[PDB]
Amino acid sequence: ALAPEIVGEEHYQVARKVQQTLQRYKELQDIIAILGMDELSDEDKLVVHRARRIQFFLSQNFHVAEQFTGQPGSYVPVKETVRGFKEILEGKYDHLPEDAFRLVGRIEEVVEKAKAMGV
C-alpha cells in the first residue's frame, strides 16, 4: 500500500526518505564504533543525528503500557504522524535532545518532555 495511487504522494516521498535515512545509518555504525566518531563527514554526521531522532520517535507511549509501566499513552491520526516526520526531516527541531523522543505521541509532546527537562 506504499504507492502514491493508494496511500498518497506526500506519504510516498516521506516514507522513502525515512527508509533511506535508516539504511544509511545501518551501514555507518561500525565505522562510528571503531574509527573515531569525529572522522565521519559533516553530511554523514547530519544523517547520523537525524537517524538517532527518527529511530527514537518511531517509539510510542501506549495504553497497554498502563499495566506494565503505568503511563497513559495516546492515539495519533495519520496526518499528525506524517507531518511530525516532515518536521523531523526538516531539522529545525534538531536542537531538542534525543532522550525526549522515546514514548511520545506528537512532536508537541516531545517539546513538553524536554520542557520538563527544561530544554
Binding site: 565505522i31 571503531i34 574509527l35 572522522e39
Partner: protein
C-alpha cells in the same frame, strides 16, 4: 554439529563486513594523502634547488 558451524559462519561474516568497510575508508585517505604530498612536492623541489644554490 550443524548449529556449531552456523555460529562460526555468522561471526566470520560480521568480521568480513568490518574489514571491507575499513578497506573503503583507507582507500579514501590514501588517495587524498598522495594528492596532498604531491601538492607539497613542488614546494620541496623549488626549495631544495634554491636553498642549495644560495647555500
Amino acid at each position: 554439529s550443524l548449529r556449531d558451524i552456523k555460529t562460526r559462519i555468522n561471526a566470520t561474516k560480521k568480521t568480513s563486513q568490518i574489514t571491507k568497510a575499513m578497506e573503503m575508508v583507507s582507500t579514501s585517505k590514501l588517495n587524498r594523502a598522495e594528492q596532498n604530498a604531491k601538492s607539497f612536492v613542488p614546494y620541496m623541489e623549488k626549495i631544495q634547488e634554491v636553498v642549495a644554490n644560495v647555500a
